[PDB]
Structure 1
Amino acid sequence: ACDYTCGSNCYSSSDVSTAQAAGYQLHEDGETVGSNSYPHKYNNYEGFDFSVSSPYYEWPILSSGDVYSGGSPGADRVVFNENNQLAGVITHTGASGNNFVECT
């Protein structure tokens, strides 16, 4: 199981989906979290090979705390579009300017 082990953290790809509907439910609800709109749309440029849609989105995924709301996730950050599908787990720290990149 856990196919997204980043920073030495075998995250469950099935658990990432739940957190995937976390930043999504908010993006579609129009509401927001913390106070800076965490769930936003990612344009992508590095060089991925996702196969979902164009209008991606970013939101932090956790496996112990809970929905991002009172702390600082950063680094891991599964992407998505508007159906809680899954663009891929990208990291925001393993690349200059914590750019995003498939967890490898």
Structure 2
Amino acid sequence: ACDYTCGSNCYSSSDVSTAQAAGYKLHEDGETVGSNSYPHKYNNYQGFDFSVSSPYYEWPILSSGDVYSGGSPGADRVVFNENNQLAGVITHTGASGNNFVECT
């Protein structure tokens, strides 16, 4: 069973923890990877019910289980705040354009 389901992608809590740790470290270091510069600021204009405060940052989570290293970021993202608290797991899959929907 999946702790988070993004479109057809299945993620366990461990996958999420791993991705967040990686993205957070980059953030602390003032570093980014990829053409789209991850991690990058995330604005909650869709009003997702996040239980932690902003600012928020988005970092790609890969279906493969590997940590994002600068290539295709896919559609899924982990969202974390300035304090390294998990805000949520979202995806571009099933949303129009560059918008998002929450993973279930």
| TM interval, short-chain normalised | 0.7 to 0.9
Q: 1:77 is paired with a residue of what secondary structure?
A: strand
Instruction: Compute the displacement of 1:53 (Å).
Output: 1.1
Among the aligned pairs, what percent are the same residue? 98
Q: TM-score, normalised by structure 2?
A: 0.85
What is the CA RMSD across the aligned residues, in angstroms?
1.9
Segment of structure 1 superposing worse, 21-30 or 2-11? 2-11
Q: TM-score, normalised by structure 1?
A: 0.85
Q: What are the Cα deviations for residues 46-87 of structure 1, in whole angstroms up to 9, with x where unaligned? A: 121111111000000125252222421231101001333211
Instruction: Compute the displacement of 1:93 (Å).
Output: 3.1
Q: 1:99 is paired with a residue of what secondary structure?
A: coil
Structure 1 unaligned spans of 5+: none
Distance (whole Å) between structure 1 residues aligned to residue 87 and residue 54 of structure 2: 10
Distance (whole Å) between structure 1 residues aligned to residue 53 and residue 81 of structure 2: 6
Query: Is the alpha carbon distance of 1:96 and 1:35 closer, same or farther for their aligned partners in structure 2, counting shifts above 3 Å?
Result: closer
Contact 2:91 2:102 in 1 (8 A): yes
Higher strand share: 2
Distance (whole Å) between structure 1 residues aligned to residue 98 and residue 74 of structure 2: 9
Aligned pairs, number:
104
Distance (whole Å) between structure 2 residues aligned to residue 96 and residue 34 of structure 1: 23
Q: Which residue of 2 aligns with 1:2?
A: 2
Contact 2:77 2:91 in 1 (8 A): yes
Query: Is the alpha carbon distance of 1:78 and 1:101 closer, same or farther for their aligned partners in structure 2, counting shifts above 3 Å?
Result: same
Distance (whole Å) between structure 2 residues aligned to residue 83 and residue 63 of structure 1: 25
Structure 2 unaligned spans of 5+: none
